[PDB]
Structure formats: structure tokens, C-alpha cells
Design a protein around this motif. Structure first.
Motif, mmCIF file in Angstrom:
data_model
loop_
_atom_site.group_PDB
_atom_site.id
_atom_site.type_symbol
_atom_site.label_atom_id
_atom_site.label_comp_id
_atom_site.label_asym_id
_atom_site.label_seq_id
_atom_site.Cartn_x
_atom_site.Cartn_y
_atom_site.Cartn_z
ATOM 1 N N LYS A 112 0.829 -1.199 0.000
ATOM 2 C CA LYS A 112 0.000 0.000 0.000
ATOM 3 C C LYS A 112 0.864 1.250 0.000
ATOM 4 O O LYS A 112 0.599 2.205 -0.739
ATOM 5 C CB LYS A 112 -0.927 -0.005 1.213
ATOM 6 C CG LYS A 112 -2.066 0.991 1.124
ATOM 7 C CD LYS A 112 -3.079 0.752 2.228
ATOM 8 C CE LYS A 112 -3.709 -0.623 2.112
ATOM 9 N NZ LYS A 112 -4.071 -1.168 3.450
ATOM 10 N N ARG A 113 1.915 1.255 0.823
ATOM 11 C CA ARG A 113 2.828 2.390 0.856
ATOM 12 C C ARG A 113 3.506 2.601 -0.489
ATOM 13 O O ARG A 113 3.678 3.740 -0.924
ATOM 14 C CB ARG A 113 3.868 2.197 1.956
ATOM 15 C CG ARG A 113 3.362 2.489 3.354
ATOM 16 C CD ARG A 113 4.472 2.313 4.378
ATOM 17 N NE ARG A 113 4.060 2.746 5.707
ATOM 18 C CZ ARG A 113 4.225 3.978 6.170
ATOM 19 N NH1 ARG A 113 4.861 4.899 5.467
ATOM 20 N NH2 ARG A 113 3.747 4.290 7.369
ATOM 21 N N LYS B 223 2.444 1.725 -3.631
ATOM 22 C CA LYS B 223 1.508 2.271 -4.610
ATOM 23 C C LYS B 223 1.131 3.708 -4.273
ATOM 24 O O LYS B 223 1.058 4.564 -5.164
ATOM 25 C CB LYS B 223 0.259 1.396 -4.703
ATOM 26 C CG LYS B 223 0.550 -0.086 -4.845
ATOM 27 C CD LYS B 223 1.429 -0.355 -6.057
ATOM 28 C CE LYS B 223 0.714 -0.013 -7.354
ATOM 29 N NZ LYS B 223 -0.711 -0.437 -7.335
ATOM 30 N N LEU B 224 0.909 3.996 -2.991
ATOM 31 C CA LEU B 224 0.548 5.349 -2.592
ATOM 32 C C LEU B 224 1.695 6.319 -2.843
ATOM 33 O O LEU B 224 1.467 7.469 -3.231
ATOM 34 C CB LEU B 224 0.135 5.343 -1.122
ATOM 35 C CG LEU B 224 -0.582 6.568 -0.566
ATOM 36 C CD1 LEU B 224 -1.471 6.162 0.600
ATOM 37 C CD2 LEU B 224 0.417 7.614 -0.146
ATOM 38 N N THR C 64 1.723 7.147 -6.380
ATOM 39 C CA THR C 64 0.618 8.059 -6.661
ATOM 40 C C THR C 64 0.962 9.490 -6.256
ATOM 41 O O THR C 64 0.688 10.440 -6.999
ATOM 42 C CB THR C 64 -0.648 7.586 -5.949
ATOM 43 O OG1 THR C 64 -1.002 6.280 -6.422
ATOM 44 C CG2 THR C 64 -1.799 8.542 -6.212
ATOM 45 N N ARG D 257 -3.119 13.731 -5.504
ATOM 46 C CA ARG D 257 -1.894 13.471 -4.756
ATOM 47 C C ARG D 257 -1.965 14.045 -3.346
ATOM 48 O O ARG D 257 -1.415 13.450 -2.413
ATOM 49 C CB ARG D 257 -0.679 14.015 -5.511
ATOM 50 C CG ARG D 257 -0.757 15.482 -5.862
ATOM 51 C CD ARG D 257 0.618 16.091 -6.057
ATOM 52 N NE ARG D 257 1.438 15.316 -6.980
ATOM 53 C CZ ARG D 257 2.509 15.787 -7.603
ATOM 54 N NH1 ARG D 257 2.912 17.036 -7.434
ATOM 55 N NH2 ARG D 257 3.190 14.988 -8.417
ATOM 56 N N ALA E 211 -3.947 11.494 -1.422
ATOM 57 C CA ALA E 211 -3.130 10.307 -1.198
ATOM 58 C C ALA E 211 -2.112 10.541 -0.088
ATOM 59 O O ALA E 211 -1.909 9.676 0.770
ATOM 60 C CB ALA E 211 -2.440 9.895 -2.495
ATOM 61 N N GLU F 169 -3.870 10.391 3.204
ATOM 62 C CA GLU F 169 -4.026 9.001 3.623
ATOM 63 C C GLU F 169 -2.715 8.430 4.155
ATOM 64 O O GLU F 169 -2.711 7.685 5.144
ATOM 65 C CB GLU F 169 -4.546 8.154 2.463
ATOM 66 C CG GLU F 169 -4.695 6.677 2.794
ATOM 67 C CD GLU F 169 -5.714 6.416 3.885
ATOM 68 O OE1 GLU F 169 -6.685 7.195 3.995
ATOM 69 O OE2 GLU F 169 -5.542 5.434 4.636
ATOM 70 N N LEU F 170 -1.596 8.762 3.507
ATOM 71 C CA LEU F 170 -0.299 8.275 3.969
ATOM 72 C C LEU F 170 -0.008 8.746 5.384
ATOM 73 O O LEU F 170 0.465 7.970 6.221
ATOM 74 C CB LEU F 170 0.808 8.740 3.028
ATOM 75 C CG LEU F 170 2.243 8.365 3.405
ATOM 76 C CD1 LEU F 170 2.570 6.958 2.931
ATOM 77 C CD2 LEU F 170 3.233 9.366 2.831
#
Lengths: 205, 100, 153
Positions: B22-23, B25-26, B29, B40, B43, B46-47
Motif C-alpha cells: 500500500k505504501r 503504490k501510494l 501516486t 496526490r 493520497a 491518507e499516507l
RNA sequence: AAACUGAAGAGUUUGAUCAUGGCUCAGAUUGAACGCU
RNA sequence: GACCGCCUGGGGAGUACGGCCGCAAGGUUAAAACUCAAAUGAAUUGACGGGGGCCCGCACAAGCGGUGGAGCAUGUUGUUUAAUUCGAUGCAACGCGAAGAACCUUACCUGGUCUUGACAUAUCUAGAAUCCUGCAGAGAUGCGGGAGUGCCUUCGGGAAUUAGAAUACAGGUGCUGCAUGGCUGUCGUCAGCUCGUGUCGUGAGAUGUUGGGUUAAGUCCCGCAACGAGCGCAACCCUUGUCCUUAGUUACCAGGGAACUCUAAGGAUACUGCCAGUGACAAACUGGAGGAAGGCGGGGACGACGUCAAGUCAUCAUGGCCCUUACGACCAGGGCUACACACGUGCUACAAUGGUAGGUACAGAGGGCAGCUACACAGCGAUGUGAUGCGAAUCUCAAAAAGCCUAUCGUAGUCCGGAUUGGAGUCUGCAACUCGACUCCAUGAAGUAGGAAUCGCUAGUAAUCGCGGAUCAGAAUGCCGCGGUGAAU
């Protein structure tokens, strides 16, 4: 605490590593950790059969473990049923088949680890340390060692003040790099603390 | 080290392994220039909203055998103490005393 | 040391005169292992004095100033039953040259000219006639030796 | 016939030793006292 | 053998009192109480001596460069704090554990929480585990909804697995390094340290091991009531110095070559081997030839019996003591980074043997997918985007700097020094306030060579100059290495 390891200082001149594989800088750490795990598991499990030189060499995933013991019969079992269980237990906590092929020590009085562990077992059986030490010296010397030194260190006989005692017979020339000196250091967990047992067996050149 | 601290490192690495992909791909992004600015930004939000221990920065390398944080070697994975013990016993292939 | 007398090292001569004396002085001027900087300092000094005095061969001039700076009697501490006696003794020729070169460099290091090469050339000129801090130090050493002149142990 | 039969050492000075030398102890005894019984 | 004198533990004490003698000073005769378990003699082994003799080590001397004065980094003390976690304390603690504290580490403080517990075995109840979710909360955590029904044996069911049901228990970086093992420092890489048998002495012990030389060496020779041995010394190991052989890519370039350098395996050489002397007809030393190397060629690793109740119970292991809804366990924030101060290690300087601006050279070693990046573009720059090569003798880090040529500065607190502060940024990272490193612009502090005192170094050394690596997401002036230039004595 001022002496180099007899095995380590001789690791490249006359001795050999008891681990012969090759890895990549990233893979090497996990190979080594798995190797140490297997070694500690083996030394805890086969604590009855007097193993002394478990050697780990892993060619391309599949490994060839080589344990050298003075009593191969007990560790192999009847028809070889303990050895199969040991095989599968090794394979479970390594990657793929670990072929454990088992050697035989034809002179248990010349291997330092067997002597040291015998003295340790005697010490945990509340045997006089001086008698155990002298018995080991005699056994090795008459079994044919060119020299034996054994050092017993700790609270010997329940003494409050720990002391270091030792006996030497023969040569055991530690500083000679080509000396073929086996060395072992074990511990006896007595009822008053740990007693360290060190054994040097000098066998030739 | 303390058994609690060893288990704490283990449970800290569990989350890292659980959110490793997940990290990645994020991160792609958020570093994508073709991606929309609000995309972005969300994203990255979310990170920063991910669970704290999921980051591979909170991971502390410890000796496999002893769990010691100080005096670690990557190539061997062990602290200096037991590294020396095993090298001197001869358990560590290739490695020997050096002089030059 | 305490047992033997070491074999001395060979010193290769200076490139532009071929003299081990100038090479050794370049070593005495040297610092931090900079042969090029020391050599240009010494060569600048030598060309300055040579062009000022109209001398074709300045190695002989350097020998003259060196023998003029060299002392002959140095005071050495001796111990005789708890008495510290400042006995005057001769100077062996190697120590003579070393003291002369060290005194020349340390005297030239404290003058007022703009460049160090100019300072060294001025000091060489001054000791040629018999003045300068090198001459004062030599005279001081001779003064102490003559001031004792009473212990021939 | 017999009255003729009797003699043990140890500890403690020193880092250790031998000597010297004091102190102390193991025995026997009592018109005994005291304590427990 | 004769006769006389004297002693009966050490002190108190040859003292008191009483006699006698004396001008006096005092002498002589001579107790006791009390007090202590010793006081003594001779010899032995050590250690020590402001005893003697002989010898060695950067021990001094001879020199070179520093530290102590400034700013900063780092460690410690003290102080201060809620805490500024713990250990290391003469050499041999103080850039030490820590090979790298924003969170984590973390062991400390504040607050929020859990109690067979984050972790192992005994167990029986359901489920393949596992994945995706919502809300509340700083987070630990709490309450809820969907998909999946493993695999081998098959109706006992099993390697793993989630939430407890409870007793054992687990857990403890809590204490004792003066209960310990293991590990390390140190005298000290000093040349010593012992043993068996023999002999001598009542004995502790001695001899050997001392003596004459010699050596780096208890190294070797010769003597010798010693004869032998063991651990130490040396050698065997690694690296470097010359050559040979096998091999020639991703290495090399004399004329595709198989020459050369190089790379990395195996060997050759060096043995006081030869000569001259000195030397007990010796060991050995001194000089010489040949050789790349000459006497141990240079450097390292290797550290005797033991000493400091040396360091470490906080790597680990362990005897004992201690706590088990807590001194155990989880999370967020803070602290370990505070500074009237003091000290220990350093870095940068105080300049002209230099600063700055242009050109122009010459390395080694190590790292690179947990990445290094050719090249192009954008930016003053740190960096950013695209893109290429390389798990590397191929591509890359990467340009070496000091050096050399020219110009300039012209001795000034400056065109020296670059701390501190203001502003604006780039990266790493969930996150740079406490508390990151770099970049840019501005500022421009002390500092002009350092008191008493004190340290390192004997040759490719000191001094100086750059370059790598471990730890590491980021964070070296420390540590560990590499080569360049290169002395004095």
C-alpha cells in the motif's frame, strides 16, 4: 581474559570452518541466522548423544548437515526412526531437504567437546572437581593425545570465592599456529552457580 | 534485550509487512506528476493517516539472538558480542581474523 | 637511541644547483612536507641575493655565509655528583651545519620584509657581512661558552 | 609364692620455617556450692 | 671437673617505697597492682631502599609538531530539572558501552490504559488462516458489518490459526561483578614463569633458572650437582618488497597481439650462505661482495604463570535476594539535546610557506537493487524531471585535494577567520517546534600564536592533503581504513 580462541586463530591456517556455504550480501544474514537456529536446536535436542562437530553446508537450498558423535547408534535410533524425525524437523525450520548424514568419532577421548561435556556432567553429578579433572587428563593422555590441558573455573566445591584450577600434561603449545589443537569451552550448571570447563587437546602438527 | 522489546519489534515489523505494498503504490501516486494535485494531496493525507508503526523508519535493527540494538551488523544480522563468539568458534563461513 | 648509531639517510641534491647543502636547507625551511614551496622560497632568496650582489655562482656564497654562521663551541650540561656544570665542548660538524641552518631559518622567520623569500635573502645578506639574529645567537652561544671556560672535565 | 607394673600431647607469635617462650586446653581429686534433672 | 655470678613471657620497671652510699647529679639493693597473648632469636622466600653493579623501552636527551588561551563538536562533573535513564572513575573513566536519541531506539518523566498478560508448554469450546470496512479516541484501544470454508486423512480427526476458562506460570535493562561463567582491560610482546627426577638443608626452601660471554629474547654457546621437560621468546599465519609458472576477461596495447602492466593462485629467493677480521680453537659481533631484499627486510595478528575481590548480573548465561491488577505490559507527548560553571578528547582558525579568481595535472582503497547513476533540460545552489548503463576489472559513486602556471590582495582584525543571528529553500521521514543535514543571501563573534603545566612521534614515520566504509530513512569534526606530498633529530 587475555587469550585468543584456539579454533578461531587457526581457522584458516590448519583448521577449517564448520560451515561451508556461499551467499549474497543480503541473503547471508538470514542464512547465518537459520544456521545458528539449527545449531542451537541440535545442541539442545541431541544432548544425550555426545555430538561435538555439527557442520552445516547448504548447496543451493538443499542442505547437507553433518553431525559427528561418539554414539551414533542412539541418535540414529532403531532401524533409523529418530534420524528421520530429526531430518523432517530440520527441514521444517529450514527451506528444503536437510540431508543429515552422521559420522562417528572413533576416539571420544581426543575430542575436546566430549571431554569437556563429560567433566561438566560429572560436576553436575556432584563429583569432586579435582578427581573429574584428573580423570579426564588420564583418559586423554592414555588415549593418545600429545597434550591435554583442562581448566575448571568457578565456585568449585561450593566455595564462596570462585577460583581457577587447571592441569596440563604433554605439550599443548597454544602459540604454534600449525599445532592441531582442538579446544572446547562448556558450562556446568551446578547448585552454586556456573562452573566453566575449558579443554585443550593438542594432537600433532 | 527485554522479551517485551523483542516482541515490540516483531509487532512493529508485522505492520510494515502488512502495509508494504500500500505504501509503495501510494508513494508512486503522490510522486506522480501526471496525477491531479488534489489526488496526490488526498493520497498524502491518507499516507499521514496510516497507522504509525506501519512505517519502515520506526524499525530498529536488533540482534537475532540477543535482541541488542547497539552494535549491529547488517551482513551478519547479529550484535557484535555473539558475532565475535560465532566467528571465533568458526560457525561463520568465510570470516576469519584479518591482518594486513 | 640507547644501543647503536643509525646509518644516516642519503639526501638528494637540489635540482637547480646540485648541492646537498642547499637541499638540506630546503628541508629545514620545509613544513608540512611541501618541497616545492620550500624550494621556491629558498630559490627566490638565492636569486635575490645573487642579482643584488652580482655573483655568478651563489653556492660558494652560501658556503661562506654558512661557515660564518657556524659556531665552534657549545655549552653542554654535565652532572658530577649532583652538580649541574655547563661545560663548554666542541660541536661536531654535522651538528654545526644543523645549528647554522636552523638558526638561519628561525631568524629569517621573524623579520619585516614582505615575502618569506625576501626575508631569507635579506638574512643571508646580513649574515654574509656578520649581522642578523643568526649572528646574535651564535655570539650568545660563544658568550656562554667563554663565560664558563672553567670546566675541562 | 606376692607385695617389684610405670611416663602421650595439642592450640596459639610468621607469608612460611626452625627455635625460644609465655598463655590455654584435654586428667585426677573435693567435707564443695550453684543450675537443670 | 671445681667454685662463683645470673635467668625463668612482654610491658609496667631497673620504676615505686624503704635502706645504704653520694656535695650534687645520682648510684646501688629492689617490688606490686594493672595490662597484653604475645614479645623474641636465627634463617627462608619476596618486596622495597633518597644501597651497589649491569641492561632495556620516544624514558630522558637531540629535534618536529601539538594540548593548556578563542569559537565550535563530543564526553564527563557539577548544577538544573518532572525527568535531565543506566554503566565506565588514577595510569588502565571522560569522541568510553553508543558502528550514529525527532518518533522508534529508550531503559527516564507526565498522562491514558491491560492483568495467564506482547512471548513458551499443559487444556476444552467455534472457525482455514486471511483480506477489505465504518465510527469514537492523540494512540493504545472499544463497538459493529461483508467475502472465503483450507490441506491430508475422512467421520477420532492432525503440523498453523483468531478471541478465554483457570491453575502452573510467564515477564523484570529490578539488586548483589564482593556469589559466578563467558568476555575484556592492564603490568606487557616485558622475558620471564614453573615442574619431574636427582642432590643439599631439621625446616620454610635451595639447585636447576646461578657464572663467563652473547642476543630483541631463560636467544645461543661454554662452564657448572645437576639432568631433563613444559608454558612463554623465535618459527609456523596474513600483508608488503623482486622474480618464475599456470591464465588472459569486463584487464593490457610493444609490434588483432599473448609482449607488458595488472589481476589472483601456486612457487623461487635470504640460509650468517661466501670473504676478511675480532672472539675461550665457541656462541657471537664488525665490515664487504653478490642480490630487489642482509642479518628480526618493513607492518600486523598471535599476549606466559599470574596482579588489580580491575570492568561488565544493561549483550548473554547464571547462584541467591526481590516484584507478580506490578519494579511486568501497551500508547501519545516530553526528556536523554537545559547551562553561573569546570575538566577530558578533538575540529576550525588566528593568515602572505597564505586567501580568492581562472586554467592544467597525478592516486589508492572501498561501496552500489536496503542502490550508484551516464547524458539532457530547469535552477545561483542544495536539488528536481526525463532517461541510460551496471549485481559490476564492463556502468557508476567520482571530481581527488595538497601540487604547477597567471592575475590579485600587500600585513590590515584585513579579500584572514566563519561562530552567532535574520530571511528564503531542498531532501529524508507519518512527522525537522523542542531537536536533522545541507543550499542560497545578509550579518560577521572571539581569535594576531596562547600562563603554570603537559602530549605524540625514530622513516615513507611525524607534519600536512584529500578519498572511502560501518552504524545509517535522514543525521561525523568521532571510529575504522586508503592513498598523495613528505621531513628534523
Amino acid at each position: 581474559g587475555q587469550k585468543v580462541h584456539p579454533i578461531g586463530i587457526r581457522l584458516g591456517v590448519v583448521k577449517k570452518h564448520n560451515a561451508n556455504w556461499y551467499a549474497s550480501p543480503k541473503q547471508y544474514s538470514e542464512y547465518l541466522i537459520n544456521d545458528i537456529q539449527v545449531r542451537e536446536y541440535l545442541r539442545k535436542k541431541l544432548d544425550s548423544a555426545m555430538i561435538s562437530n555439527i557442520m552445516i553446508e547448504r548447496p543451493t537450498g538443499a542442505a547437507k548437515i553433518t553431525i559427528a558423535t561418539a554414539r551414533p547408534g542412539i541418535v540414529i535410533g532403531k532401524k533409523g526412526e529418530d534420524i528421520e524425525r530429526l531430518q523432517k524437523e530440520l527441514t521444517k525450520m529450514m527451506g528444503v531437504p536437510a540431508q543429515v548424514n552422521i559420522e562417528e568419532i572413533t576416539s571420544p577421548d581426543l575430542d575436546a567437546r566430549l571431554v569437556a561435556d563429560g567433566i561438566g556432567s560429572q560436576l553436575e553429578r556432584r563429583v569432586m572437581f579435582r578427581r573429574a579433572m584428573k580423570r579426564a587428563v588420564q583418559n586423554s593422555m592414555r588415549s593418545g593425545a600429545k597434550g591435554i590441558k583442562v581448566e575448571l573455573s568457578g565456585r568449585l566445591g561450593g566455595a564462596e570465592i570462585a577460583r581457577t584450577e587447571w592441569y596440563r600434561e604433554g605439550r599443548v603449545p597454544l602459540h604454534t599456529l600449525r599445532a592441531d589443537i582442538d579446544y572446547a569451552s562448556v558450562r556446568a550448571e551446578t547448585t552454586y552457580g556456573t562452573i566453566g570447563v575449558k579443554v585443550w587437546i593438542f594432537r600433532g602438527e | 534485550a527485554k522479551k517485551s522489546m523483542i516482541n515490540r519489534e516483531l509487532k512493529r515489523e508485522k505492520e510494515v509487512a502488512k502495509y508494504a505494498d500500500k505504501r509503495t503504490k501510494l508513494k508512486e501516486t503522490i510522486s506522480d506528476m501526471n496525477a491531479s494535485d488534489e489526488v496526490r494531496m488526498d493520497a498524502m493525507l491518507e499516507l499521514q493517516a496510516l497507522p504509525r508503526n506501519s512505517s519502515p523508519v520506526r524499525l530498529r535493527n536488533r540482534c537475532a539472538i540477543t535482541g541488542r540494538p547497539h552494535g549491529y551488523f547488517r551482513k551478519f544480522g547479529l550484535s557484535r558480542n555473539m558475532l565475535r563468539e560465532r566467528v571465533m568458534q568458526g560457525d561463520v563461513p568465510g570470516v576469519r581474523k584479518a591482518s594486513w | 637511541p640507547r644501543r647503536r648509531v643509525v646509518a644516516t639517510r642519503e639526501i638528494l641534491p637540489d635540482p637547480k644547483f646540485g648541492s646537498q647543502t642547499i637541499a638540506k636547507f630546503i628541508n629545514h625551511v620545509m613544513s608540512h612536507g611541501k618541497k616545492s614551496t620550500a624550494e621556491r622560497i629558498v630559490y627566490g632568496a638565492l636569486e635575490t641575493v645573487a642579482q643584488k650582489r652580482n655573483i655568478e655562482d651563489p653556492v660558494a656564497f652560501f658556503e661562506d655565509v654558512l661557515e660564518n654562521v657556524r659556531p665552534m663551541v657549545e655549552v653542554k650540561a654535565r652532572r658530577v655528583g649532583g652538580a649541574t656544570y655547563q661545560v663548554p665542548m666542541e660541536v661536531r660538524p654535522s651538528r654545526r651545519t644543523a645549528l647554522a641552518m636552523r638558526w638561519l631559518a628561525e631568524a629569517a622567520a621573524k623579520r619585516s620584509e614582505k615575502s618569506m623569500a625576501l626575508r631569507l635573502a635579506g638574512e643571508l645578506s646580513d649574515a654574509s657581512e656578520g649581522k642578523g639574529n643568526a649572528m646574535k645567537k651564535r655570539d650568545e652561544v660563544h658568550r656562554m661558552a667563554d663565560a664558563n671556560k672553567a670546566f675541562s672535565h
